[PDB]
Amino acid sequence: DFHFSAIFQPTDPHHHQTEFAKVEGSEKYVEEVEVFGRQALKVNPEALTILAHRAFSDVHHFFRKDHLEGWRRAIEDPEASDNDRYVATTLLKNACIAAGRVLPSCQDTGTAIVLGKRGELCWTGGEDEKYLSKGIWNAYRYHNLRYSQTAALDMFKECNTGDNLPAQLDLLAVPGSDYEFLFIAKGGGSANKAYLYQETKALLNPKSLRAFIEEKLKTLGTAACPPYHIALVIGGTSAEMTMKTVKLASCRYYDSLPTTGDKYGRAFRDPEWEKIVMEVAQKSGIGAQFGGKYFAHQARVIRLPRHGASCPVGLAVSCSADRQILAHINKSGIYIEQLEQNPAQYLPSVKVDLKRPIDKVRQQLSQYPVGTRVMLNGTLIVARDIAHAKIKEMMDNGEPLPEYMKTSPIYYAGPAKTPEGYASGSFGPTTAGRMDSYVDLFQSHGGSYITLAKGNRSKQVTDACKKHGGFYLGSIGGPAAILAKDSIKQVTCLAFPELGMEAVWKIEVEDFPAFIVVDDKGNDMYSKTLA
Amino acid sequence: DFHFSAIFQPTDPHHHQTEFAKVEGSEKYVEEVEVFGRQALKVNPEALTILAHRAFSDVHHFFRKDHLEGWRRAIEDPEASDNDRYVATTLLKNACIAAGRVLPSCQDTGTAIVLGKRGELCWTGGEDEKYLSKGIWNAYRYHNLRYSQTAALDMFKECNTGDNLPAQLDLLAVPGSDYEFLFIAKGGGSANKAYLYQETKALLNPKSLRAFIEEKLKTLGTAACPPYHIALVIGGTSAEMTMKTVKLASCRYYDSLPTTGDKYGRAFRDPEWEKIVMEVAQKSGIGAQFGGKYFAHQARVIRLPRHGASCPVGLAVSCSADRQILAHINKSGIYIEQLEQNPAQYLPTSVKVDLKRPIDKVRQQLSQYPVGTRVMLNGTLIVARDIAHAKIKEMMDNGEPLPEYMKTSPIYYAGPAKTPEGYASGSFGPTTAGRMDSYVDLFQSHGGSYITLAKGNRSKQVTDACKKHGGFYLGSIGGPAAILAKDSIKQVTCLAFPELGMEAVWKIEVEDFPAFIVVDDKGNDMYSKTLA
């Protein structure tokens, strides 16, 4: 009566649908052997270093076809909004610059995540975590990436690790003699849009589930740089299993799952509800960041078994910095997924002078409604999470709001490392909502009247800008390389240099595009689509 | 220069602080060999079946010392409330019954979870998932446990799998030649109290974090049968990593982590904030289910590294059915954690309600008493939980009446485990009440569900419904399923929907069934102050 049924039964478990290139000469790192009658593979652990280094180098300069096709679709679709096409064109042009292998596609080169599947008879010497980490360390140290990891010295005292370690190393024990991998360079803001809901049987009917999807999609907002790859997981054997599954779904790792369930509880993709998710995304009007049809590239919906008392639900996105790369080691060597190296084949405003007293800039912005495109020319002061927290603490101790918060628009951003001979490394915006708790306070103390970042913000920011005569400008989210190449002319560290990329910067910019998202009158570009 | 630092650096990675018993004769399943100069272990995969079967048998009848000590503390502490002592005594007596190896400690024998760590040179043949699953299958099939897993035939059509499979099998590749395990029989309602928050640097100061903890602990309520082992994880490299870590923390798997961080971002346990979590839990007044000090047994707080843009936070509990067991396979055979076989060593006023009356007379009697009154129920209960409620609502949406069997007796939210030979009932404690909240006003408007019996605090809509319709919600003690079955449940019959398995509608006869009036017919709620 016993019948074993694996929860996940992909028809393409080894991802034969993906194209791989072999690392030249890498057969020297492997040797097929036969031990106690079974075929085994000896793997020099240096192969893990070589592989992780190339994976976390390639993934920052190239994209998958399904991602690039989505941007082209947003440009060519007659039903796309003007802003849809503008954002998608900008992101495609950014990808063309990133393909030069100098500037990464996003300033947030992400957390390094490794999903590894080591066969029973794949023998590495066992130090896999160290050798993978060395390859990751090499990639972030010797390329123009960013150190984004924050170590906790105690509960509240933190420092940057200075090398983008530690990585997340999830190494699984599986049958066979190969070693199979998924490498993910996961952006922080898209990682933040991984949500867990604890639901019930009352959700599991067509009307309730549709309404749930409509409600939860809006909570993604534009804070993770859409168009999104949207993943939705209904059910699971635990919260952590649901959230792992929705991460992998967003990487299209489970595309080959069955599409029907059975009495043993196997996982399945649900194409009918993927289409419903896409209908909700298109009809939302949220669009590719600034209103339209292209909130989502595509959708993945996976239905999982559940304890009768339980219904965990996971929702997650892959952002414009859609960065994953499959790989495997076998008796022939090291194979790595081939990304698109020629993204160019997929391609088919009010001037604001910042070199003035800030009150004159505010006066000019007050002449325009939300949704107006602007082009900024002049100085920006750059500050994000830790700098804002340190400045609030200073004011709580009776110190003034610093002069540099009162002279220029505040750009929420943290740069990647500067290539030799370049004025700036990749340097796109940070999610604005994380700074919302500071805006009324800083404006009440005479600063932060104009902020520049990406993503929709909470009502407290709209209220603050109306009370204090402020503005929130939305940069396009994601196009960090083209912003650096074309707009950023000078970069200087202003304060808190120990914070690394989170230091306060002073930058000089030209032709920096943005939209007026929140004005000084109570209006919000997102008030209709993200209410 | 490059310096590798593992995130997790326990000082006791093989859990030497835990006592293990050897499975007699199990060295016959292993053989030490040497290939390419390296020591390897051949393991007969039948060892995986034997180990999983014993693990998911033992864990339903015995508890760890730190769990039992927590119940004893709630009895002996002068600061414990009278209800704290009553609940902890009931749970200890339940454990004494479960130690008889016939009735499981809870009717929810849980989801079977296996965390495995297979050494590079531990050679099983590779069919680990099947052989582990067979042992789990054996444990749930041939013992008086419960089939709790629900398969999705399509997005909405469901059926019970009938064997408590599939299991969650997380098998990791690690150094060496051994095989190490943590087995968890995870209750559904405590699994539901695993929460993920997406926070920011603005949280990471003493005032904000303390207020956050106070707010979020209240959202656990009593819905997962406290006293809780409370686990809190601040940070993490991804949502799924944070939630895995908070699960393992609640199982005390990370107790030997360092207690300080470093510039490489290693994880650490934070004893100062564990003490703060315990102070918040104690001062909340929520107590061991019915007001008092013993909301929590103990706390685990793990601080993790984070991307500068990110601060995932995990909060989770282990419930009264605190069920995990460590194990390992090595050159000497199969070893399994030794749980406490003699829980009795930890052991040191009510209104009688006759349910064998017209339901309106029972309502009239209950209306005489305030919330917090302890009652003892004698008579018939109609038993229905999530799927039966959904099916009955669907019938009503299609124009059918509320069934008469929903109008004659109080409704007990519960699903029984299998009945031992010669017993009137298997373990048969209550289901979480909150999951049925959306049905109460509707059913009461149609003349039924005026009195409900379950565990956990409920939402405001239920308080409002009971005031509008002259209803009551009675809180059973949560967790003591074996002593309820042994002493209180006298007859069990299936009344409707037999295809739902444990989720069928049952008609049961009970005696001396304890409960508290949680919501009355006047707008009052026993939890309105502690869980406001």
Ligand SMILES: O=C(O)C[C@H](S)C(=O)O
């Ligand atoms: O770290 C970054 O630069 C981008 C992320 S998405 C953020 O700040 O929200």
Ligand SMILES: O=C(O)C[C@H](S)C(=O)O
């Ligand atoms: O399944 C059970 O019997 C107990 C769980 S905790 C529940 O239903 O709330």
Ligand code: SF4
């Ligand atoms: S594309 Fe946007 S969300 Fe994604 S990593 Fe870059 S800034 Fe963050």
Ligand code: SF4
């Ligand atoms: S003790 Fe309570 S929460 Fe835990 S499994 Fe049993 S009924 Fe569910």
